[PDB]
Ligand binder design. Structure first.
Ligand SMILES: CCCCCCCC/C=C/CCCCCCCC(=O)O[C@@H](COC(=O)CCCCCCCCCCCCCCC)COP(=O)([O-])OCC[N+](C)(C)C
Ligand SMILES: CCCCCCCC/C=C/CCCCCCCC(=O)O[C@@H](COC(=O)CCCCCCCCCCCCCCC)COP(=O)([O-])OCC[N+](C)(C)C
Ligand SMILES: CCCCCCCC/C=C/CCCCCCCC(=O)O[C@@H](COC(=O)CCCCCCCCCCCCCCC)COP(=O)([O-])OCC[N+](C)(C)C
Ligand SMILES: CCCCCCCC/C=C/CCCCCCCC(=O)O[C@@H](COC(=O)CCCCCCCCCCCCCCC)COP(=O)([O-])OCC[N+](C)(C)C
Ligand SMILES: CCCCCCCC/C=C\CCCCCCCC(=O)O[C@@H](COC(=O)CCCCCCCCCCCCCCC)COP(=O)([O-])OCC[N+](C)(C)C
Ligand SMILES: CCCCCCCC/C=C\CCCCCCCC(=O)O[C@@H](COC(=O)CCCCCCCCCCCCCCC)COP(=O)([O-])OCC[N+](C)(C)C
Ligand SMILES: CCCCCCCC/C=C\CCCCCCCC(=O)O[C@@H](COC(=O)CCCCCCCCCCCCCCC)COP(=O)([O-])OCC[N+](C)(C)C
Ligand SMILES: CCCCCCCC/C=C\CCCCCCCC(=O)O[C@@H](COC(=O)CCCCCCCCCCCCCCC)COP(=O)([O-])OCC[N+](C)(C)C
Ligand SMILES: CCCCCCCC/C=C\CCCCCCCC(=O)O[C@@H](COC(=O)CCCCCCCCCCCCCCC)COP(=O)([O-])OCC[N+](C)(C)C
Ligand SMILES: CCCCCCCC/C=C\CCCCCCCC(=O)O[C@@H](COC(=O)CCCCCCCCCCCCCCC)COP(=O)([O-])OCC[N+](C)(C)C
Ligand SMILES: C[C@@H]1CC[C@@]2(OC1)O[C@H]1C[C@H]3[C@@H]4CC=C5C[C@@H](OCCC(CO)CO)CC[C@]5(C)[C@H]4CC[C@]3(C)[C@H]1[C@@H]2C
Ligand SMILES: Oc1ccc2c3c1O[C@H]1c4oc5ccccc5c4C[C@@]4(O)[C@@H](C2)N(CC2CC2)CC[C@]314
Ligand SMILES: Oc1ccc2c3c1O[C@H]1c4oc5ccccc5c4C[C@@]4(O)[C@@H](C2)N(CC2CC2)CC[C@]314
Lengths: 1097, 183, 57
């Protein structure tokens, strides 16, 4: 079977053929007209029964008694005399002729289908989404008129209610009733425009025009949609999307649908509107020009439990306008206090021809409907209440259903409508039980509903008291919003093992992720012993700065719109942007370094650059507002961010525009110069004063008035010397001059013959490297406070520190061999322990020349070239691998052809690489190419096949010398162009690193540094740019920062609103409105001139 | 700092409770030193009816265009009673419409008596960020601080339920500013 | 079209098969070719994971 529609559903047929409601008919043909015009109660003439038994009722006699007593005439029903059977009509309508020939699923099923089977059909089979609202549109079932204004004024609003909520609209489907005008709303306003409306039409099958076409197993039945526009015929409206055509086994009688529609309303209102939201899907009724029975249908709702609100429209002067009339007459309680019944009874009969009797009984219904005037709503178009029927239909669920303030709020959340919640829920009158707004906040955060989170904070929600450890863990562990797949894998990486299957994320584990992502020596609060001794136990279970914690949450969960919102709220705004940049940057790197090929890394990199640019633009706001306070923002210790600074965080992210900003550079210049105040020509004034100490007194020094602000800060003769030598610019040149003297000596040592005992030059060289090594050990341990393992990893992340480490270790291996070698020989090169040591020195000196590139990179021009070279060498690997394969592809055949008598030796390795490598540089070995030529320098190599090798070398050089070298050059040219474009930015970032480096160094260079060591560690036993603010100036700085955040958004909005695109569009929208306003003059000007022609007489 | 919870980004406004007999220089120290306000180039003192009143729609957006420009093109301190029962309510209308400052601060102080302020209690506290319900019944005339002002000097005379403690301190402030060099 | 993420996700599932290493797969595979017991230390997809794989055969 494997077919749920066919297997489950049911079609009835009338098995039973009583005459047409009495004696068959007169007309002398008698038995003959019994074929022509004699039907059943079934609604079908004799040949339209067509049942297997009804055809045995076409041959001899019918299925009854001889004369068929009359309590069998009444005995026909659609319960006992109709046979259920699998269905026939279902598929997709093709409304051929209607505007792209719309499509709409359809099905023929009995009135007695169980309500759950219906729900299975709508949601499972048809793949419909469970809605967040159900609008049931009742109205007049007979072709009626509708004024042009109200037409386009209804179809703007009912559509928005079903489009802003995903509401199922419900109709009869057939165009004879209100469904025709629901279609008008759909045609105009381009009903969905990629934003589906589901409007089901539940109609009876026995009335459908062209019943036949739809018959067929899963058939695409087409359907004429252009019959006479006046002739009222039960023709399905071509703009609906779904049809449930209710069968009662009959033809030509309505009323089989009344239950199944209502049963569907019950069935949906007993479904959860959302996973967390514990309400039922709301239902509401809408009334467009109702007939008589529509009145009772209102009451039929107002009583039932739970009730159903009823929004009654106006216009057209029937049940719709009528209920609008009396709804203004009856009092607040619900009983007309005046004596004005015969006047409204008069009005009933002007709309419903009764005369007196049904008129009152029709009035008797309504006085009960006017009891429950809280579940009734009138949207009158004239004086324009509610501003919209959208909000009216929606607001009707909020008033009159005695719903808690919470239930009112959370339903707007499901719908994602703040405009209704702001205006209609948050208002004087609501009472708001103890923890309802907070539970609302949790739902809004979890569901990524930023607009409500905004609203809740404004309307009285404290994030300080809201945000707890349990609620924060519930936010990390949810799956009901935008998630980050990576986060689970980052937790699995920092938790070295695996996890039980239903592992719920812990904040300690988040803390370990944040430390991984921030790196260096960052330590999160969550990993600290205080928080642990709290957390293991679980005023203290709250957080002092919740908006810091939720920013981290939103970024780790890849919830960027929420992260941008939580950034602009709270304190520490520049830090939060810089932390966010680093977090996303590191996640981007993890994605890039994974084996997955996707767009996650470029997405996360973009998010990092978004917050990075916010931090730069905030720094420029602050700098233009107040330079001194801008510099304080760069330097204040961030207690909440591992005691770091915003400058250090920006450096951790390779955020060069922030570091290159003038404010940062001004800060760095003051550190570099110290108390020195030369504006020009400082390099040689410092050099000559290192070498001529009395020239120190001729230099310009800052006054204490100047050395007072310096927002990173921590004249007699003696203090001028102190000021000079403790200045980092001086420590640079003093270290530089000593380093150059070091190299000149060590160069002398390796070039000059080495004796038994080191020369005085060599001793000085040894002393330098030894004390330079002690310095490097101390730079690691007196580095940024952290774990020793973290300190180690950071310091070995620089190139020149790895090189210096190898340089230092190799030197003392070399010195040990050079110095501890016993001389069995007078020659001193017969001893090969000694020679090994000397050769290490000769290679070790390379490290020390290459370390001069780091000194030279202190210059603004040289520095970017040094970074170029590093990037060239670091990224050329794969081109060189290809070059090596090309080399061997030539080297191996050359050796094999030219030297065919070789036994295995390691000389084979040399010979296959050696000459081919030197060819890269243009050495062709001209007189070795053709070994059989007269001018050959290898005549003994002449032999069989040796004529091949010139052809091989011809190809090799073309590929190697021309193609491959110039590919490598092309790669290097791109590096040049990339770095040159950002050259000034590159040096300004380098400038941070060397100013910080020499700020922390001691005042003596590495030969004499030992005294600075030996004197300092006494003062600790015997007895960098970080501003330590008090809590009062800390609060002023936060106030400064929030002002500049406000000014940032203001300028952003002003720039946006001044842009030409924004001016074209507002003009566009505004000219459109005016074109109606002028037609509204062009319309009213008639009413003037024609009324003047009326008063002309 | 008030937190006018419920009003359109929940505006902020500094506040203080001080006696009617505070020396006029101490006031000037508060406005300029403590609150870091700039010495203005004008002072507009808005007086009017202290009882809820009506205002035609045209004149509404035709006043709030101009009083704002005068205080925005000059850096003028506007002065009111603060409480919405009086003219301060409509100074707020001028501020709401026309986006009062738009990155171009107006300083509108409201000098009110403390003994009439609705929800006196909330504001009590050393340097506290006291929030403040700004959505009471729109008709009911109750002495409720207007959520669009920036500063409040709530004049204490040791009482409850009587105005008239502010009449001097406001005028004394006017003297104190008019004896300051404009530049 | 071939460079689109959907195609690349499809191709990645084929390349790894029932293996499920996200990082450092090249040497985990090499060392496990050379040390077959290291095959057991590797991460494998569950059948729940090896169920959709819209090119799986
Ligand atoms: C034994 C001698 C031959 C090998 C050479 C050894 C010497 C050193 C040279 C090595 C060059 C090869 C480097 C790549 C392989 C290492 C791992 C790797 O990255 O694999 C990659 C595929 O790897 C391949 O496709 C390599 C195929 C083998 C090439 C063998 C010849 C190369 C040498 C030619 C002869 C001349 C030169 C040598 C002199 C004779 C896949 O890497 P991944 O990790 O999936 O991707 C990283 C990016 N991610 C983070 C986004 C995922
Ligand atoms: C922008 C740029 C700015 C400017 C930058 C400027 C940089 C300024 C840098 C400046 C200093 C440069 C000097 C270093 C090289 C000296 C070598 C030399 O000439 O040796 C000769 C001199 O005699 C001696 O050297 C004897 C002294 C032994 C110890 C060396 C100390 C030298 C001074 C350094 C003090 C420590 C400094 C370092 C501390 C770490 C010895 O050779 P000889 O006599 O021919 O040999 C005899 C041969 N025979 C055996 C055949 C007879
Ligand atoms: C974060 C920090 C970054 C920087 C790293 C910092 C750490 C840097 C660490 C550096 C040390 C690296 C290891 C060196 C090992 C020497 C090996 C060697 O040559 O052995 C030889 C000498 O062995 C001897 O013991 C005699 C030589 C004297 C000792 C000189 C080296 C130690 C000083 C180190 C000072 C380091 C200062 C560190 C200060 C902090 C053994 O062989 P032989 O005796 O020659 O054999 C003779 C045979 N024959 C007789 C047949 C001919
Ligand atoms: C790239 C494709 C080629 C094959 C690849 C496989 C590697 C092949 C590895 C080969 C090295 C292993 C074999 C050692 C045998 C040495 C014997 C000898 O004569 O030494 C000679 C030199 O050599 C030495 O003195 C010591 C070895 C240094 C060179 C090798 C370094 C490794 C290459 C680095 C890159 C790593 C390699 C890994 C792969 C890239 C000494 O003799 P001589 O200098 O002729 O003369 C001196 C004076 N005499 C005449 C008095 C003696
Ligand atoms: C005397 C004769 C005997 C000796 C002969 C020896 C032969 C020659 C041997 C070696 C040549 C010296 C260079 C070695 C490699 C450089 C590392 C590197 O790429 O760093 C770079 C990246 O990578 C890292 O920072 C980490 C990678 C290295 C791991 C740490 C060292 C571990 C021990 C050793 C294992 C590693 C390999 C070395 C082991 C041999 C750092 O770049 P950077 O500068 O940070 O750029 C930004 C600068 N900024 C922050 C200021 C903006
Ligand atoms: C990380 C630290 C690692 C290293 C720590 C230190 C380990 C200890 C290291 C060395 C100790 C060596 C002591 C002697 C060994 C026994 C042999 C012997 O005595 O004589 C032989 C020595 O032959 C040699 O080759 C000696 C030199 C070996 C060093 C090789 C480079 C390693 C260091 C590179 C830098 C690495 C650093 C990289 C930086 C990261 C021959 O000499 P002979 O006997 O006098 O002469 C007999 C021949 N004759 C008859 C012709 C005269
Ligand atoms: C005795 C002979 C004479 C001496 C030689 C001359 C002295 C040597 C000269 C220059 C040495 C290097 C200068 C360093 C400059 C600083 C760079 C830095 O900070 O970090 C850089 C690393 O930098 C490196 O990795 C350096 C190179 C490694 C050592 C190899 C040396 C060349 C030999 C092999 C060649 C021979 C091959 C053929 C062999 C047959 C970091 O840059 P990056 O990672 O690219 O940045 C990416 C940024 N991103 C994050 C946005 C992606
Ligand atoms: C897909 C195509 C397939 C190829 C089909 C064509 C097949 C080839 C067709 C023509 C090549 C020319 C003929 C060979 C040379 C003749 C000389 C001879 O016999 O002896 C020679 C060696 O002894 C030999 O037997 C050499 C045989 C060559 C092997 C095949 C080469 C293939 C070329 C690759 C094809 C690339 C095609 C082009 C691509 C751009 C020389 O001996 P001798 O030097 O006199 O002896 C020295 C004496 N002494 C020791 C006293 C000093
Ligand atoms: C290489 C050429 C020079 C040769 C000269 C002879 C050798 C003389 C060299 C060294 C011995 C004398 C230095 C003082 C002793 C160390 C005290 C110290 O470090 O700082 C002390 C104060 O700092 C000072 O008092 C300033 C000392 C540095 C300037 C010395 C200039 C002499 C060298 C160049 C000009 C000479 C002209 C000739 C050169 C052309 C205290 O320490 P701190 O730093 O404040 O803080 C550290 C922590 N602590 C406070 C807990 C301790
Ligand atoms: C080169 C180094 C290795 C030397 C080792 C000694 C030799 C061992 C090597 C080869 C002989 C053993 C192989 C099994 C016989 C063939 C069956 C087969 O192909 O697949 C069968 C099932 O698949 C398997 O049974 C998996 C076979 C692969 C695992 C073997 C790894 C051993 C080599 C590396 C690790 C060893 C450690 C040493 C290496 C460091 C069936 O075929 P199919 O593929 O499913 O489908 C084809 C169509 N069919 C189904 C209709 C039939
Ligand atoms: C992908 C690339 C393909 C090409 C290639 O790299 C990888 O493949 C490698 C294989 C290597 C050889 C293997 C074995 C030996 C025997 C040894 O014999 C002992 C010495 C003797 C002294 O007398 C004892 O007494 C001498 C060396 C030799 C011939 C190797 C040379 C280099 C070769 C050709 C390498 C070549 C560059
Ligand atoms: O580019 C800068 C432009 C202007 C200023 C600086 C800049 O950088 C600084 C820097 O760098 C120097 C290098 C050599 C000699 C003198 C300086 C200086 C000077 C200075 O100290 C200074 C002014 N103010 C303090 C003064 C109170 C305002 C702080 C910032 C400062
Ligand atoms: O880029 C991708 C991003 C996300 C995913 C994939 C991507 O590529 C695939 C790929 O590649 C890998 C390489 C190494 C280790 C694991 C994988 C994977 C994993 C995966 O299987 C996986 C999720 N889903 C199935 C799961 C039901 C969702 C299918 C697609 C898949």
């Amino acid at each position: 079977q494997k077919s749920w529609i066919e297997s489950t559903l049911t079609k009835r047929e009338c098995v039973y053929i009583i005459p047409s409601s009495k004696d068959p008919h007169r007309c002398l043909p008698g038995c003959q007209i019994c074929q022509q015009l004699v039907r059943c109660f079934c609604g079908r003439l004799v040949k339209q029964h067509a049942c297997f038994t009804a055809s045995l009722a076409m041959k001899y006699s019918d299925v009854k008694l001889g004369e068929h007593f009359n309590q069998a005439i009444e005995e026909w029903s659609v319960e006992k005399h109709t046979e259920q059977s699998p269905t026939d009509a279902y598929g997709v309508i093709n409304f051929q002729g209607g505007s792209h020939s719309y499509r709409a699923k359809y099905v023929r099923l009995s009135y007695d289908t169980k309500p759950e089977i219906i729900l299975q059909l709508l949601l499972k089979e048809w793949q419909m989404e469970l809605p967040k609202l159900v609008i049931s549109v009742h109205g007049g079932m007979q072709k009626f008129e509708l004024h042009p204004r109200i037409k386009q004024l209804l179809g703007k609003g009912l559509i928005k209610a079903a489009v802003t909520t995903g509401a199922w609209i419900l109709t009869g489907g057939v165009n004879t009733g209100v469904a025709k005008h629901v279609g008008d709303a759909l045609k105009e306003h381009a009903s969905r425009s990629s934003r589906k409306i589901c409007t089901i039409g539940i109609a009876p099958w026995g009335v459908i025009e062209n019943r036949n076409d739809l018959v067929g197993r899963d058939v695409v039945a087409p359907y004429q949609t252009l019959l006479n526009p006046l002739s009222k015929l039960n023709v399905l409206n071509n703009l609906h999307s779904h049809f449930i055509l209710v069968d009662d086994g009959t033809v030509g009688k309505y009323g089989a649908e009344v239950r199944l529609r209502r049963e569907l309303e019950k069935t949906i209102n007993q479904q959860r509107i959302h996973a967390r939201i514990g309400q039922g899907v709301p239902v509401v009724a809408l009334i467009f020009e109702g007939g008589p029975n529509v009145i009772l249908t209102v009451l039929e709702y107002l009583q039932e439990s739970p009730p159903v609100p009823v929004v009654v429209c106006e216009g057209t002067g029937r049940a719709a306008d009528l209920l609008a009339y009396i709804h203004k007459q009856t009092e607040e309680g619900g009983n007309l206090p005046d004596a004005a019944e015969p006047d409204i009874i008069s009005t009933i009969k002007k709309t419903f021809n009764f005369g007196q009797s049904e008129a009152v009984h029709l009035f008797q219904t309504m006085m009960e409907c006017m009891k429950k005037k809280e579940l009734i709503t009138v949207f009158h178009i004239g004086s324009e209440d509610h501003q919209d029927i959208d909000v009216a239909i929606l607001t009707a669920l909020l008033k009159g259903t005695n719903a808690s303030a919470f239930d009112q709020l959370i339903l707007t959340l499901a719908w994602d409508r703040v405009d209704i919640a702001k205006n209609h829920v948050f208002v004087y009158g609501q009472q708001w039980l103890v923890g309802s707004l907070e539970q609302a906040m949790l739902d809004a955060l979890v569901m990524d509903r930023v607009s409500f989170v905004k609203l809740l904070i404004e309307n009285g929600v404290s994030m300080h008291k809201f945000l707890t450890i349990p609620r924060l863990e519930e936010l990390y562990n949810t799956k009901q919003g935008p998630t980050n797949p990576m986060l689970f894998h980052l937790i699995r990486d920092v938790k070295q093992g695996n996890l039980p299957p239903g592992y719920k994320i812990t904040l300690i584990d988040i803390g370990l992720v944040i430390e991984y992502l921030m790196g260096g020596t960052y330590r999160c609060t969550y990993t600290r012993k205080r928080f642990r001794l709290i957390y293991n136990s679980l005023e203290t279970k709250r957080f002092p700065y919740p908006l810091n914690e939720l920013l981290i949450w939103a970024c780790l969960m890849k919830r960027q719109v929420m992260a941008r919102f939580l950034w602009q709220h709270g304190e520490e705004s520049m830090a939060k942007a810089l932390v966010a940049c680093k977090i996303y940057r590191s996640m981007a790197y993890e994605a890039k370094q994974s084996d997955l090929v996707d767009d996650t890394s470029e997405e996360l990199k973009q998010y990092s650059n978004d917050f990075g640019q916010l931090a730069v633009e905030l720094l420029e706001q602050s700098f233009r507002q107040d330079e001194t306070m801008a510099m304080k923002l760069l330097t204040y210790e961030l207690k909440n961010w591992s005691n770091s600074t915003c400058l250090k965080l920006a450096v951790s992210s390779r955020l060069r525009p922030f570091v290159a900003h003038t404010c940062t550079q001004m800060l760095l210049s003051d550190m570099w110069m110290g108390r020195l105040n030369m504006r020009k020509n400082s390099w040689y004034k410092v050099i000559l004063s290192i070498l001529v100490p009395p020239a120190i007194l001729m230099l310009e020094y800052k006054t204490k008035a100047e050395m007072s602000h310096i927002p990173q800060s921590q004249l007699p003769i003696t203090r001028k010397f102190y000021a000079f030598y403790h200045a980092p610019i001086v420590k640079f040149w003093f270290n530089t001059l000593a380093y150059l003297g070091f190299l000149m000596l060590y160069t002398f040592v390796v070039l000059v013959k080495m004796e038994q005992l080191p020369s005085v030059q060599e001793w000085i060289v040894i002393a330098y490297i030894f004390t330079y090594a002690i310095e490097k050990v101390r730079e690691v341990f007196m580095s940024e406070a952290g774990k020793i393992s973290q300190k180690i990893k950071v310091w070995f992340s620089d190139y020149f520190n790895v090189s210096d480490t190898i340089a230092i270790i190799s030197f003392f291996v070399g010195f040990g061999l050079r110095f501890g070698a016993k001389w069995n020989y007078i020659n001193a090169y017969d001893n090969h322990v000694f020679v090994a040591g000397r050769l290490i020195y000769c290679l070790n000196i390379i490290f020390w020349y290459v370390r001069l590139l780091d000194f030279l990179a202190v210059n603004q021009q040289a520095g970017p070239y040094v970074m170029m070279i590093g990037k060239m060498v670091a990224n050329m690997f794969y081109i060189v691998v290809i070059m090596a394969l090309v080399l061997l592809s030539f080297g191996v055949p050359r050796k094999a052809i030219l030297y065919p008598h070789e036994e295995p030796s390691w000389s084979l390795a040399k010979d296959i690489v050696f000459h081919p490598y030197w060819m890269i540089f243009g050495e062709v070995y001209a007189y070795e190419i053709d070994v059989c030529a007269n001018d050959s320098t290898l005549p003994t190599i002449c032999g069989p096949g040796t004529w091949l090798t010139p052809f091989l070398q011809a190809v090799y050089l073309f590929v190697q010398y021309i193609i491959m070298v110039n590919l490598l050059i092309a790669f290097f040219n791109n590096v040049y162009l990339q770095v040159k474009a950002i050259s000034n930015i590159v040096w300004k970032y380098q400038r941070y690193h060397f100013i910080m480096a020499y700020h922390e160094k001691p005042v003596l260079p590495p030969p004499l540094i030992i005294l600075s060591h030996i004197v300092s560690l006494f003062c600790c036993v015997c007895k960098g740019p970080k501003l330590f603010l008090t809590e009062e100036d800390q609060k002023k700085l936060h106030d400064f920062e929030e002002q500049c955040v406000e000014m940032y958004f203001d300028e952003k909005d002003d720039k946006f609103n001044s842009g030409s695109e924004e001016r074209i569009r507002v003009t566009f929208e505004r000219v459109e409105q005016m074109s109606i306003q002028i037609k509204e003059v062009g319309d009213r000007v008639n009413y003037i001139k024609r009324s003047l022609q009326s008063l002309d007489s």
